[PDB]
Design a protein around this ligand. Structure first.
Ligand code: PNJ
Length: 850
């Protein structure tokens, strides 16, 4: 029942190996080979050893000769085997693109068989293994994402020099007796009342010995004993189906905030002759999911009978697929700190632990295949990936089986996208549906993330109409343009493009002169944006920032304006979709922000950056997604309350006030006694009238207080008397140009205010520190302290990351106080005492001890 991952390898180019058979012979010399940990691409392995500078900085990645990655590389290891009484297997996936496998001088599998990143291989190497020092070697072939059913980077970033060739998951060494236990899973079915489930346990047993056997498969499912005995001819595999097991009052798995995240255990041993032969432990969640088309044709998800608006971002791993379990948990925890409920994985489907963590945290996941490369090559015409040939078909089907087998018992998984872009043709789709059936993968299948239908499954109920680059806030509120990206249907991949990270991140990824060019000439190409010509520069963003904000006087000016613009836009993108969710006609049913994060240090399509720092786009998404929320509609000036939580709320007061930039209140409305339903329902407080005498740029302060008088949401907008308007006729696929621009340049002259800071920290016994900061607007006039950003820093003024704040980027009127809370690992302080750096738009910068 042993399954031990290979901890590491030594790697080298096949340019250095003239005899393949030699590598896997015990004693083969490996002087000058590179030691690498498990889950390394070739280039990630070279970085581990020195060998090139940090690709996260400037154009370092360009200085890597890529030619060396157009030939195979070897991954080699020794294995000590004390006792050959047990059978021996190599069980693995994640080979990019394909490999020959060698044990002790014998080629056990070729690249024609071991082919495709997602395919699983269970290689019986019993005949090759001997007592003592054994050796195993993979000759990994070059990866081309357009030719191979693998992973590529579309236009998200820049191309890794090795194109991710390597082994990016574990290779397991399995030991067992005559009988191998495989593919153990639990089919679970809950009644609609959610108080009774039925469990069908299924498990494969394979007799790899020379003789016929009886095997008993026995153990526990959800704490209940189970046992079946079957016969197996030599070399026979069987699927064992256990009689149905009833489960009363199951601990139902819920998305975060809707209840708990319990997973049950399955524990099984296959015995032969009254002796354990193999063993497997796994988990499953008791949870119903559905994804159906509503009367408007939009894809509508529900979990456990509760419909949900999907509010998420597109998730990506590291550009060089460097794996770290804590980092993965840190990234999914940020999902919840944002108030989001879902992540989409367009290809790049992460190792199991990622899904264990999403399960444990209650983050929903939307895995599927990616566009714009080999996956869609047979259906995507003149776009990138190659037409399919006969050998492609069984690789794609085996990839689907293997992913379906991996993914089926994770309750976070809410669907599989079998297409992205183009939906599969009938033959490809049929192979996917067959693979999923064979794996008992029973979750919703979505044909595409675009509007494109598949022949069998049908309409997607989703859209990808853009945009991916600058559009003003009001754009998201559009319902009139059926070929655009307004708040209706399921928005599976959309953003307003550029997302300048914090100054602290900027200074780590770009040179002074690259940064100088970024503010002075946004039209210039930026390596840390995209390899795509369409998204190669920041021109649309820079032009709108100038038009709407005012010209940038320096780098600092440009960055600070970038943050307001990103906060404003991302906030509107999300708020519009929350509002329109309960529309009678063409409701919004989903929004996946493009993207949650970036594969590397970037200037676009991120909420949190590669270092886990949090900028305007982050805080804006967090503001929009708070559980009891007040917001202002850019289209019609309606003030709207959203309740994200699982219970209806009552006796809410919504208070809306307009101020000129000199602090003069120009409008007040107090709406008491509001009720709002659960799980995304809304209430309208008031429609703000056109008010006379407003400054060109003015402020709207929205405050929601519960029946106890507690302030539960504060939302401040910087607004203009001059409207953003669209030139809909100038629209391209990725954006819509503006015919006129809001004037928010009044912010440039907003008078100075003051804060107002005290902080203290508590090192907990769970290895985390909580820093509490109390901020007060301490000025003696009428001016608000506007957009005040607090950052946990060490003694050198460097941000402590990752971090989670309850609230941030706050605005306080004179006399007003707010208390803020930041949590992080004590160890990420690295022995420094904590301080807090506090910067406001109109309050300057100070740091206080904590
Ligand atoms: N799935 C990709 C998405 O695919 C689309 C296909 C068609 C349209 N369209 O036709 O408006 C829009 C988007 O394009 C993004 C931006 O290039 C990529 O980053 C995503 O990975």
């Amino acid at each position: 029942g042993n399954a031990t991952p290979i901890p590491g390898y030594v790697i080298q180019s096949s340019a250095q190996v003239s005899d393949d058979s030699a590598v896997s012979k015990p004693g083969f010399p490996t002087s000058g080979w590179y030691p690498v940990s498990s889950r390394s691409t070739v280039y990630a392995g070279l970085l581990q050893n020195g060998k090139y500078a940090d690709p996260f900085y400037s154009t370092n990645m360009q200085n890597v000769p890529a030619a060396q990655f157009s030939v195979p590389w070897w991954y080699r290891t020794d294995l000590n085997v004390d006792d050959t009484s047990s059978r021996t297997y190599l069980d693995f996936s994640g080979v990019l693109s394909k490999a020959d496998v060698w044990v002790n001088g014998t080629k056990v599998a070729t690249k024609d068989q071991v082919n495709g990143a997602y395919t699983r291989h269970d290689l019986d190497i019993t005949a090759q293994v001997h007592t003592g020092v054994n050796s195993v070697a993979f000759k990994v072939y070059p990866n081309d994402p357009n030719r191979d059913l693998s992973m590529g980077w579309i236009d998200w970033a820049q191309t890794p020099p090795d194109q991710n060739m390597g082994i990016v998951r574990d290779v397991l060494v399995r030991r067992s007796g005559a009988v191998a236990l495989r593919s153990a899973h639990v089919i679970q079915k809950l009644n609609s009342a959610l108080d009774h489930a039925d469990l069908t346990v299924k498990a494969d047993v394979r007799n790899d010995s020379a003789n016929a056997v009886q095997t008993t498969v026995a153990g526990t499912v959800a704490g209940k004993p189970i046992s079946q005995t079957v016969s197996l001819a030599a070399k026979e595999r069987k699927t064992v189906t256990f009689p149905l097991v009833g489960l009363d009052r199951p601990n139902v798995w819920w998305p975060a905030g809707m209840g708990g995240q319990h997973r049950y255990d399955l524990d099984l041993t296959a015995s032969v002759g009254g002796t354990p032969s193999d063993a497997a432990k796994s988990k499953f969640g008791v949870r119903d999911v559905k994804a159906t088309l509503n009367s408007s044709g939009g894809r509508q998800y529900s979990v456990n009978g509760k419909p949900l608006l999907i509010r998420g971002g597109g998730y990506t791993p590291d550009l060089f697929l460097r794996w770290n379990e804590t980092a993965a948990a840190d990234k999914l925890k940020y999902v919840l700190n944002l108030g989001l409920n879902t992540v989409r994985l367009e290809g790049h489907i992460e190792p199991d632990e990622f899904f264990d963590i999403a399960d444990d945290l209650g983050v929903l996941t939307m895995p599927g295949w990616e566009c714009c490369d080999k996956w869609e090559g047979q259906v995507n015409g003149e776009e990138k990936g190659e037409p399919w040939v006969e050998s492609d078909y069984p690789i794609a089907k085996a990839s689907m089986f293997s992913e379906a087998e991996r993914l089926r018992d994770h309750p976070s998984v809410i669907s599989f996208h079998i297409g992205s872009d183009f939906a599969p043709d009938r033959r490809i789709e049929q192979g996917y549906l067959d693979a999923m059936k064979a794996a008992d993968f029973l979750l919703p299948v979505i044909p595409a993330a675009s509007a494109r239908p598949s022949p069998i499954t049908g309409a997607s109920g989703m859209k990808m109409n853009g945009p991916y680059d600058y559009v003003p806030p009001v754009y998201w509120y559009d319902k009139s343009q059926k070929d655009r990206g307004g708040a209706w249907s399921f928005n599976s991949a959309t953003s307003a493009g550029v997302d300048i990270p914090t100054m602290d991140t900027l200074k780590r990824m770009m040179s002074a002169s690259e940064l100088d060019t970024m503010w002075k000439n946004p039209s210039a190409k930026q390596y840390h944006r995209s390899s795509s010509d369409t998204f190669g520069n920041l021109k649309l963003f820079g032009d709108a920032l100038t038009k709407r904000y005012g010209a940038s006087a320096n780098l600092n000016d440009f960055v600070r304006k970038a943050q307001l613009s990103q906060y404003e836009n991302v906030r509107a993108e999300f708020e519009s979709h929350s509002r329109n969710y309960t529309d009678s006609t063409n409701p919004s049913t989903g929004l996946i922000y493009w993207m949650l994060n970036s594969p590397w240090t970037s200037l676009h399509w991120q909420l949190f950056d590669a270092y886990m720092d949090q900028n305007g786009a982050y805080y804006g998404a967090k503001k929009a997604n708070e559980p009891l929320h007040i917001q202002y509609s850019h289209d019609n000036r309606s003030v709207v309350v959203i309740n994200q939580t699982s219970n209806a709320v009552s006796g809410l007061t919504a208070t809306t006030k307009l101020y000129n930039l000199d602090g003069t209140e120009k409008y007040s409305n107090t709406k008491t006694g509001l009720s709002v339903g659960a799980l995304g329902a809304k209430a309208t407080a008031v429609t703000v009238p056109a008010v006379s005498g407003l400054s060109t740029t003015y402020l709207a302060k929205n405050v929601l207080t519960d029946s106890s008088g507690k302030e539960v949401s504060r939302n401040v907008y910087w607004l203009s008397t001059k409207a953003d308007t669209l030139n809909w006729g100038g629209s391209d696929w990725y954006y819509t140009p503006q015919s006129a621009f809001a004037d928010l340049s009044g912010l440039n002259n907003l008078g100075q205010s003051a804060v107002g800071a005290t902080a203290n920290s508590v090192a907990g016994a769970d290895g985390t520190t909580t820093t509490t900061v109390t901020l007060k607007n301490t000025s003696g006039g009428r001016l608000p302290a506007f957009y005040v950003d607090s950052k946990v820093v060490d003694s050198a003024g460097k941000p402590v990351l990752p971090v989670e704040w309850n609230d941030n980027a706050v605005s306080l009127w004179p006399g007003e106080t707010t208390t803020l809370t930041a949590k992080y690992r004590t160890a990420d302080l690295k022995g420094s005492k904590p301080s807090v750096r506090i910067s406001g738009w109109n309050t300057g910068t100070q740091t206080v001890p904590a």
